[PDB]
Amino acid sequence: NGVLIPHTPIAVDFWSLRRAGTARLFFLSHMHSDHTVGLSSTWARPLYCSPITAHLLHRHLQVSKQWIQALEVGESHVLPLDEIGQETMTVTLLDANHCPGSVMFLFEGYFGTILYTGDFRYTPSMLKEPALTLGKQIHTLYLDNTNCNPALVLPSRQEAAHQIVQLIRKHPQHNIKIGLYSLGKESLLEQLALEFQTWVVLSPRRLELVQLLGLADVFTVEEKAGRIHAVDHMEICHSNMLRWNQTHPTIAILPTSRKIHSSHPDIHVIPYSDHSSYSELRAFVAALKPCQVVPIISVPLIPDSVQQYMSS
Ligand code: NI
């Protein structure tokens, strides 16, 4: 899902080195496991991400802080595009509403004005951003088209949370297992501690993420402290259901955005989305008025100092 912006040394969510070649500036929109393969402690090329994303990157992939130029969201920053003090480029990061520390990259330079949305959840608060309200003409919109496919309809983030509450409402005497990825859906955990008036059980790593975000003190790591446990999504399987059901009558919930058949009756696959709906995007593009939209073309005039930067 990485993107090499053609005729630029720009790479967003791309870390293959050998497949890039021309790339010299690598951006990280958010810290989901799917957009970061090749990133580790051996990574030694400049990297730009959001504040929260900077903490999560150094801590959980052991990436050296010397390669992580973290920039504040909302503000525009001047990045070099060569080895001399000549060409530069402005980047403005915009909150993506997708997950903790998720951003949208807005580039400006010899290539034009490119807006990279990455993964993002649309809300009309996004149009009111000062970066996109100066009437600037975006030349290319690398847009999140996840829910633009006409295949299978996934409910919104709030529709799925309603079904989860109805599910636990019908099982008041049950232990609830919730499978998640390494990031996202922490605010949903908060909504379940309120509705059901329990403490939510996490792993120590997940507890660190939550305190990093500034959420309510409704979480704990003691197993016996609550009926709702948050576990890794790869834990929810037929073998583990029998293991949990041997102790206490347990229900398992899998919030996923893919077609999955429950391999156990007490496993409930709930369709999540976490991306903008089609109509939300069609109003998002009708407001931006971009010259062209690219899913996740014109060749610019590469300067002399930038053409050398790409070939070393
Ligand atoms: Ni993501």
Numbering used by the authors: 2 to 297, 314 to 329
Question: Anything the authors wrote about it?
Answer:
Human SNM1B (SNM1B, Apollo, or DCLRE1B) is a 5′-to-3′ exonuclease, which was first identified as one of three vertebrate orthologues of the yeast DNA repair nuclease, PSO2 (4). SNM1B is a member of the metallo-β-lactamase (MBL) structural superfamily, of which the β-CASP (CPSF, Artemis, SNM1, PSO2) nucleic acid processing nucleases are a subfamily. The SNM1B sequence comprises 532 amino acids, wherein the N-terminal region (amino acids 1–332) contains the catalytic (MBL and β-CASP) domains, and the C-terminal region the protein-protein interaction regions, including the well-characterised TRF2 binding domain (amino acids 498–509).
In addition to the structure of SNM1B1–355 (nucleotide form) we solved a structure of unliganded SNM1B1–355 to 2.8 Å resolution, hereafter denoted SNM1B1–355 (apo form). For the apo form, only the M1 metal binding site was occupied; XRF revealed iron, nickel, and zinc present in the crystal, with nickel being the most abundant. This metal ion is coordinated in an approximately octahedral conformation, with a bonding network (H31, H33, H99, D120, and a water molecule) and co-ordination distances in the region of 2.3 Å consistent with each Ni2+, Zn2+, Fe2+ (39). D35 which forms part of the second metal ion coordination site (M2) adopts a different sidechain conformation in the apo-structure compared to the nucleotide-form structure. Overlays of the structures of SNM1B1–355 (apo form) and SNM1B1–355 (nucleotide form) reveal they have the same architecture with similar relative domain orientations. The most prominent differences lie in the ordering of the extended loop connecting the final β-strand on the MBL domain with the C-terminal helix (residues 297–315), and smaller but still substantial shifts in the two regions connecting the MBL and β-CASP domains (residues 146–159 and 266–279). These regions cluster around the 5′-phosphate binding pocket, with significant shifts to both main chain and side chains required to accommodate the AMP_1 in the apo form structure, suggesting an induced pocket. However, whether these structures represent the catalytically or physiologically relevant forms of SNM1B is not clear, and it is likely that the presence of Ni in both the apo and nucleotide form crystals is due to the use of Ni-Sepharose in the purification process.
